[PDB]
Curated annotation (Swiss-Prot):
Residue positions of motif Nuclear localization signal: 202-205
Location in or out of the cell: Virion; Host nucleus; Host mitochondrion
Name of the molecule in the record: Polymerase basic protein 2
The keyword Protease is assigned to this record: no
Protein encoded by which gene: PB2
Entire-sequence positions represented here: 535 to 742 of 759
Length: 208
């Protein structure tokens, strides 16, 4: 698509706008054949905006984060998928980091989309169902019938489930790096980002 022709902000907001226009059908291909969802032309414009270095490392993170949501029924999150969907276009690459952000190149440095929650580049509110990018209204989501309500977030960490807010019972917040230490099923409080400590739990079953 020609969104490229009026450049960067136009790829951002047109990508998200397209996504929620086509959501009905995008959501179904996400489940039935996502390699081919991620291989759609309508995403090539967006991939241009992500540094050619981490680009594919991200896509790996994200492809993994999405299989986790597929595998962990009960956790479906419509916003979180739309938000990350662009980043899975780049061809994947093993990385072992837990990205809290993704950089979109905008003016000459560009902005950062959070994995967890909101950014001027991507702004959803929940009781009003309305998406806002760079100030622009990008449409509005309608959420799934089995939209998760358990407070469990399967698409923020690469082998963990966020389970709720800080639980004192489980110790002072760890750092993200220390999460490799933990064992299956093991629950800790982490520093996720912003001022946020969340209770998480190393997942008890394997990746795929």
């Amino acid at each position: 698509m020609m969104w490229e022709i009026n450049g960067p902000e136009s790829v951002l907001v047109n990508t998200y706008q397209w996504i929620i226009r086509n959501w009905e059908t995008v959501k179904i291909q996400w489940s039935q054949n996502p390699t081919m969802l991620y291989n759609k032309m309508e995403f090539e414009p967006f991939q241009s905006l992500v540094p050619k270095a981490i680009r594919g490392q991200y896509s790996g993170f994200v492809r993994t984060l999405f299989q986790q949501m597929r595998d962990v029924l009960g956790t479906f999150d419509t916003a979180q998928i739309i938000k990350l969907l662009p980043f899975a276009a780049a061809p994947p690459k093993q990385s072992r980091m837990q990205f809290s952000s993704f950089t979109v190149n905008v003016r000459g440095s560009g902005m950062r989309i959070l994995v967890r929650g909101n950014s001027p580049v991507f702004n959803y509110n929940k009781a009003t169902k309305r998406l806002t990018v760079l100030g622009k209204d990008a449409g509005t989501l309608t959420e799934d019938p089995d939209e998760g309500t358990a407070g469990v977030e399967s698409a923020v960490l690469r082998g963990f489930l966020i389970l709720g807010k800080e639980d004192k019972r489980y110790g002072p917040a760890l750092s993200i790096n220390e999460l490799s230490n933990l064992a299956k099923g093991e629950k800790a409080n982490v520093l996720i980002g912003q001022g946020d400590v969340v209770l998480v739990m190393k997942r008890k079953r394997d990746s795929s």
